[PDB]
Design an enzyme around this catalytic site. Structure first.
Site, short mmCIF file in Angstrom:
data_model
loop_
_atom_site.label_atom_id
_atom_site.label_comp_id
_atom_site.label_asym_id
_atom_site.label_seq_id
_atom_site.Cartn_x
_atom_site.Cartn_y
_atom_site.Cartn_z
N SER A 349 -4.42 4.76 -6.57
CA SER A 349 -4.30 4.55 -5.13
C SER A 349 -2.82 4.54 -4.73
O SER A 349 -2.05 3.69 -5.19
CB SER A 349 -4.96 3.23 -4.73
OG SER A 349 -4.76 2.95 -3.35
N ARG A 350 -2.42 5.48 -3.87
CA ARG A 350 -1.01 5.63 -3.53
C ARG A 350 -0.49 4.49 -2.66
O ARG A 350 0.70 4.16 -2.70
CB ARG A 350 -0.76 6.96 -2.83
CG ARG A 350 -1.32 8.16 -3.56
CD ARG A 350 -0.83 9.44 -2.94
NE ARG A 350 0.61 9.59 -3.11
CZ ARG A 350 1.31 10.64 -2.70
NH1 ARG A 350 0.70 11.64 -2.08
NH2 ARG A 350 2.62 10.69 -2.91
N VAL A 351 -1.39 3.89 -1.88
CA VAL A 351 -1.06 2.76 -1.02
C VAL A 351 -0.96 1.47 -1.82
O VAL A 351 -0.05 0.66 -1.61
CB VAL A 351 -2.15 2.56 0.05
CG1 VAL A 351 -1.84 1.33 0.89
CG2 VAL A 351 -2.29 3.80 0.91
#
Ligand SMILES: Nc1ncnc2c1ncn2[C@@H]1O[C@H](COP(=O)(O)OP(=O)(O)OP(=O)(O)O)[C@@H](O)[C@H]1O
Ligand SMILES: Nc1ncnc2c1ncn2[C@@H]1O[C@H](COP(=O)(O)OP(=O)(O)OP(=O)(O)O)[C@@H](O)[C@H]1O
Ligand SMILES: Nc1ncnc2c1ncn2[C@@H]1O[C@H](COP(=O)(O)OP(=O)(O)O)[C@@H](O)[C@H]1O
Ligand SMILES: [Mg+2]
Ligand SMILES: [Mg+2]
Ligand SMILES: [Mg+2]
Lengths: 485, 55, 470, 485
Positions: A349-351
């Site tokens: 998950s990039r966030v």
């Protein structure tokens, strides 16, 4: 007339080419003598190619066709909640006519660069392996990629159910309306999927856009966009809406069919060049509006079905490139027992923490570490006790940490119930407990807190954080239960 | 004493095995590319040949 | 009568173009007829090329058509006989009797083409269906009125499998059944027809409880692409009008796509990926949607799917999974070991695989068996590279069991008795679960593995282990 | 005028677009002014597509064309026996006109569902590896798939040679006439094949149909179909026939050529869409007829040519699906010394023991299953670990059974000679003999029975089964020989 009307020159393959309509718009709807409608995607100097929403048995040669002067539009608003509509937006559940607050074009432009905010509002899925490992954020685009029969729907489905914790509340900026987009699924499946949400009281805030496989291709083409608008409504008005595309794979197939029949250039795997422009122009519609725009938000959970783990395929590569993270699922992990089988190694998950509760972040920062070293020393577990004590310790944790993530279906847990389980796992208060009793451990432990330390749980639910006082109070309550166990 | 000599040799045996087998993987992994690309280009040729059909 | 005359203008393979007159064009999916000295060559409208020209699909041999023969418009889609009149008789695609029993006296004639039931009409059930096969009833049990799928490459056991199901359900079902042979060996039909007489299901001078529709592979692309519909229509009738339980057996369902795949090129369709036609998802869709249970009647469907080159990533198989509630995948890698039916326990799933359906006890036992077989397959890299001695005490004990259960999944069918030499054995679900449960607890760690190979009930295991010792 | 005649519009590559012919039928034979005949496959308003059976350097624009009025048929009957004809059925051996009894079409409908019988009649192939493991049955089609230079033709060829045991007899219902169909082969080879048949007095009950590579593509395409009609003849008159196609792989290439040249859209790898229907309506034509029909039958031994051992190919998969099993032949086993190199692991027979001889059925019951265990143990002893009594016992026998199955070409063995050998194998009387001894053992043991215990061979032959008494004598005859030498 010839300008507002036209004659069918040729019909077939659910696509009829008409002559006339010299003033017809692009992708505009039209109506045939029989009653079946279609939309012209190709606008040629001589004729006009028009796809059908119904059987091509109704359309004949020379038949008359008239304009509608309207682009694909669907009615949006809070009236849809608790209903079941098709790609166009008509009722199919038999609960009467719909009450919409307006309409929106199937094709809407995504929010510009300026009218947005860094995602910061967590989307609690109620899945321990998710909210702990791969946190999802309001406005994020998290992809649920995985082979057939892996648990892709389970992820989303539980997420929706886990929303009864806020939707039946009073505050709006906390709720989350769910919009499920059935594409290419048989009716029997939808009728069941719906019947599950009801037995759990989830239809109260869920919108079903059914697009069964028997329906014409274009229907399965417009379904995702139709539902897209419906949710944007919530986003624009300053709220929160979760939309799950299940699945984009089927959508592309439908679109490929139309494109080929219309004799458009075939690309890799028989997909036209605009196939990527399709999904990119869909996912980018979901985001996080800024404070000035309304602080509204639209989350997207697109589903992609791979063929034997082949994430290198055309379609998947497109989707994976656009989304902001994947929840890769493997059948193998499923067989072992690890359910949901969420491959921690690949799932990303990039966030990340940006959209995860600090109450859980304080105990999850380390959980990614142990698991990481566990996958590296997993081969050693197969060998004799000749393993040194250092590596052995890792195995003790991993076996148990992996056993905790195993969560039964239709059984989401709130953050107040996740933290206590993660905290006891990370520190290692389960290492002494048998790897066979880990399951019943969760049961008896939660019930304990809710009767003796209820004040602690409720403070975590409200504050959302863990102060030095709680960290000590939680530890003392744990060591006490582990002792008496 | 002759046991300590077996473990010592066996520790060398499996060291080179991992190096050869390991390096063998970096060789077949290249053949997996050319063979992947071949299937993508071949499947594409039939698609083009079926559409280039005229009179 | 006021029929519409026509005239053939082109003939290419199974594709015939007819040129009608203005204002006299038949809609799509309409049948046609052409008088021949031998018989009748029915055609099916496909497209409208324009200029009063229509393209049809030859339902039979195209050889013998003369440039410009006059075609008679049927005036509607292909009509097939329906009713209890079709019980105990063999019927082809066109709805003509092919058993030498004279004309089929039906009160109605319903078209093979029809729309799928409405979302409102869809009815969900959770009832379980007891067949008698251990590996199935324990792992992926079939649902009453559900859709079943038997996946498997060539020569895995899909036919024998579906044949046994008939030998254990059809007689034991107080209702009607419909078998539809699509693209298969004409000889398999023959044996079938012979067995239905010998079992008593079909009586020539009595009553029958099953109809037979065949459109085998010997038939042209036109036939195999619509034979599935022909038999579906007869089933559907007992569904709504008769309002009663019905067993639909389709074998094979893969020929439905394939057959269409052959002609799609000649109909001017740009070949999709893998060569299949673009209209795969829809066609495969308009067939499965019709095959379902409504609030009018229940229909249990057993469709065997073919897997080209033992490849499950193939579109044809891949697409079919979503239209199935219970999937029974057959692996060739399991056949070769001698264990049959070569059912893959991990890859095969079911809808009724829920505690709240099969029972809590049933689920747990089933889950344990799956986990055992998985670790076994996980240690396959150690049992050959380091032996069995290197495994831990917990591992060796599990491995042995995994081997016993694996061989315990095999079951002799009365149908393939000529292959195994051993008399068929039908195990009850109530005993099945009780058997593995006992083996999972280690109550038979003394009994030899060969005592579980090709054995029915658990009692037989102990009986066999004792007969060998002699 | 042009109803029965036409003028050529274009010509080349064996294709000729003639104009006119508005009363010609589908697939009807025609004749040009040059003398060369042709076949009409594409019927169009503008022109008619015709394929040439000969060179096209003779046809020119504006030439006259005439029709035959009849569908391309071939002469049939006993007369052909011993003669070598071409696609059309004309003599090419130079031994007079073909005295046929009737004439049947190329394309014939497969036998009915009603007029059939389950296969129960064996087909002595003389190959022990075959008649013991994968038996052939009068009315089935056993595939012979494998790479080039393996021994595909061999299996078939020896079969025909073995039939001499009954064709020289008086009884008809026991004999079995053979039809070899050379397609794609060079005339050099065919000549040598027919030479070999004569060297074994096997040409008298054998019919050969030649469709060498040099001939026109339409000949190679029609060759199998016409050839089948030839054999069907016996099937209908209550006699038994055995047709061998070699090979359908070339036929598809040929049929692919007409399609592409007639400008017919290709499917996969340029093959015509209905390429399946090419072999399906061919193999189904062979089957066992009802007692009402004549108890006649036609057996088929289709041959396919794989590339690099890839059975996952397009054409091969198409045929594997139709044939009642396949005799897989691997190149690798050939060098290892397994000749014929029949891979039991992949070779199966769907008819199974039903077709096998009853006598041979007893002596080898789980033999195929045992050879499966052998490869299981053979692979596991690769580890280089010592083997106990069990794993070595089966390893000893399994290794010798594989050596017993090896049989020389052109050396068909009767049933009375196969039973004894297999008997001494499955039991364990060869275990105590060296591997390089199994060779001469076979010949010596046979000569032993033919001299002393010949009465037994005579009972097995006639009875075809094993009685309680016959086993006793057979048992003692074996042990007595082991003691000798
Ligand atoms: N968390 C879970 N716990 C227990 N069982 C589960 C869980 N998730 C999924 N299942 C099982 O998975 C099956 C269906 O899986 P799921 O629908 O999630 O996969 P999918 O992504 O929908 O695959 P498909 O593309 O075939 O629909 C059910 O039989 C159910 O028993
Ligand atoms: N049983 C056998 N034992 C030893 N050698 C054999 C046997 N059968 C065939 N061979 C050898 O194999 C070679 C080729 O055999 P064969 O003609 O059967 O191959 P094929 O399958 O026909 O290949 P192709 O189709 O190219 O002719 C021949 O030279 C022959 O000597
Ligand atoms: N119960 C069984 N036990 C052992 N072998 C079986 C069994 N059922 C089928 N087979 C094997 O499978 C073969 C038939 O395959 P079939 O059912 O036609 O598979 P497919 O559906 O792939 O054609 C038989 O010849 C037999 O050898
Ligand atoms: Mg799903
Ligand atoms: Mg089969
Ligand atoms: Mg050869």
């Amino acid at each position: 007339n010839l300008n507002e009307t036209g004659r069918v020159l040729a019909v077939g393959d659910g696509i009829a080419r008409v002559f006339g309509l010299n003033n017809i718009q692009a992708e505009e709807l039209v109506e045939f003598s029989s009653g079946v409608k279609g939309m012209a995607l190709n606008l040629e100097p001589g004729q006009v190619g028009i796809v059908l929403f119904g059987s091509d048995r109704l359309v004949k040669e020379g038949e008359l066709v008239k304009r509608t002067g309207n682009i694909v539009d669907v009615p949006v608003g809070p009236g849809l909640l608790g209903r079941v509509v098709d790609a166009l937006g008509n009722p199919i559940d038999g609960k009467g006519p719909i009450d919409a607050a307006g309409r929106s074009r199937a094709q809407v432009k995504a929010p510009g660069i300026l009218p947005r905010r860094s995602v910061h509002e967590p989307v609690q899925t109620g899945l321990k392996a998710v909210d702990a490992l791969v946190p999802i954020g309001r406005g994020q685009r998290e992809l649920i990629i995985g082979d057939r029969q892996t648990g892709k729907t389970a992820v989303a489905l539980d997420t929706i159910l886990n929303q009864k914790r806020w939707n039946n509340g009073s505050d709006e900026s906390k709720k989350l309306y769910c919009v499920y987009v059935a594409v290419g699924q048989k009716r029997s499946t939808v009728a069941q999927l719906v019947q599950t949400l009801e037995q759990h009281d989830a239809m109260k805030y869920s919108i079903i856009v059914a697009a069964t496989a028997s329906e014409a291709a274009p229907l399965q083409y417009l379904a995702p966009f139709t539902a897209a608008s419906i949710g944007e409504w919530f986003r624009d008005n300053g709220k929160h809406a979760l939309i799950v595309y299940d699945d984009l794979s089927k959508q592309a197939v439908a679109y490929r069919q139309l494109s080929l029949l219309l004799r458009r250039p075939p690309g890799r795997e028989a997909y036209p060049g605009d196939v990527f422009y399709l999904h990119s122009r869909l996912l980018e519609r979901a985001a996080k509006l800024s404070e000035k725009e309304g602080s509204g938000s639209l989350t997207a959970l697109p589903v992609i079905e791979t063929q034997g783990g082949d994430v290198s395929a055309y379609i998947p590569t497109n989707v994976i490139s656009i989304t902001d993270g994947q929840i890769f699922l493997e059948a193998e992990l499923f067989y072992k027992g690890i359910r949901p089988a969420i491959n921690v190694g690949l799932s990303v998950s990039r966030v990340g923490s940006a959209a995860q509760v600090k109450a859980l972040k304080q105990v999850a920062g380390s959980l990614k570490l142990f698991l990481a070293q566990y996958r590296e020393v997993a081969a050693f577990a197969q060998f004799g006790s000749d393993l040194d004590a250092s590596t052995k310790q890792t195995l003790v944790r991993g076996e148990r940490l992996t056993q905790l993530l195993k969560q039964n279906q239709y059984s989401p847990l709130a953050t107040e119930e996740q933290v206590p389980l993660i905290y006891a796992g990370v520190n290692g208060h389960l290492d002494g407990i048998e790897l066979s009793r880990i399951g019943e451990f969760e049961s008896s432990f939660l019930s304990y807190l809710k009767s003796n330390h209820n004040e602690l749980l409720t403070e975590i639910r409200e504050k959302g954080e863990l102060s030095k006082e709680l960290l000590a109070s939680l530890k003392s309550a744990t060591e006490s239960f582990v002792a008496t166990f | 004493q002759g046991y300590a000599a077996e473990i010592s040799a066996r520790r060398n045996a499996m060291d080179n095995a991992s190096k050869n087998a390991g390096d063998m993987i970096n060789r077949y992994s290249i053949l997996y590319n050319r063979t992947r690309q071949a299937v993508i280009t071949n499947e594409l040729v039939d698609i083009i040949t079926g559409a280039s059909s005229l009179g | 009568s006021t029929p519409i005359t026509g005239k053939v203008t082109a003939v290419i393979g199974a594709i015939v173009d007819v040129h009608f007159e203005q204002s006299e064009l038949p809609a799509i999916l309409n049948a046609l007829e052409i008088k021949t000295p031998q018989g009748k060559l029915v055609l099916e409208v496909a497209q409208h090329l324009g200029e009063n020209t229509v393209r049809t699909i030859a339902m039979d041999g195209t050889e013998g058509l003369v440039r410009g023969e006059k075609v008679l418009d049927t005036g509607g889609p292909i009509s097939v006989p329906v009713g209890r009149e079709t019980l105990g008789r063999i019927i082809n695609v066109i709805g003509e009797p092919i058993d030498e029993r004279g004309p089929i006296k039906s009160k109605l004639r319903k078209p093979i083409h029809a729309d799928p039931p409405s979302f409102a009409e869809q009815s969900t059930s959770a009832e379980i269906l007891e067949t008698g096969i251990k590996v199935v009833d324990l792992l992926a049990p079939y649902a009453r009125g559900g859709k079943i799928g038997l996946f498997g490459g060539a020569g895995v056991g899909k036919t024998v499998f579906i044949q046994e199901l008939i030998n254990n359900i059809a007689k034991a079902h107080g209702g009607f059944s419909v078998f539809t042979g699509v693209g298969e060996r004409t000889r398999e039909g023959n044996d079938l027809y012979r067995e239905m007489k010998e079992t008593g299901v079909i009586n020539l001078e009595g009553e029958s409880k099953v109809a037979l529709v065949f459109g085998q592979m010997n038939e042209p692309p036109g036939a195999r692409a619509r034979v599935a519909l022909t038999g579906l229509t007869i089933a559907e009738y007992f569904r709504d009008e008769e309002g009663q339980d019905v067993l639909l057996f389709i074998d094979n369902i893969f020929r439905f796509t394939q057959a269409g795949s052959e002609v799609s090129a000649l109909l001017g369709r740009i070949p999709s990926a893998v060569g299949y036609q673009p209209t795969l998802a829809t066609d495969m869709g308009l067939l499965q949607e019709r095959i379902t249970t409504t609030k009018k009647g229940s229909v249990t469907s057993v469709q065997a799917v073919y897997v080209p080159a033992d490849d499950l990533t193939d579109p044809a198989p891949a697409t079919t999974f979503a239209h199935l509630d219970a999937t029974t995948v057959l692996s060739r890698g399991i056949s070769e070991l001698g264990i049959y039916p070569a059912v893959d326990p991990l890859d095969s799933k079911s809808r009724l695989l829920d505690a709240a359906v099969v029972g809590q006890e049933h689920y747990d036992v089933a889950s344990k068996v799956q986990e055992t077989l998985q670790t076994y397959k996980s240690l396959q890299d150690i049992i050959a590279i380091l032996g069995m001695d290197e495994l831990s005490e917990q591992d060796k004990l599990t491995v042995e069991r995994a081997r016993k259960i694996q061989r315990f999944l095999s079951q002799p069918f009365a149908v393939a008795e000529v292959f195994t030499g051993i008399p068929g054995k039908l195990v009850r679900l109530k005993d099945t679960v009780a058997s593995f449960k006992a083996v999972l607890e280690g109550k038979y760690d003394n009994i030899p593995e060969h005592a579980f190979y090709m054995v029915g009930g658990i009692e037989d295991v102990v009986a066999k282990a004792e007969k060998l010792a002699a």
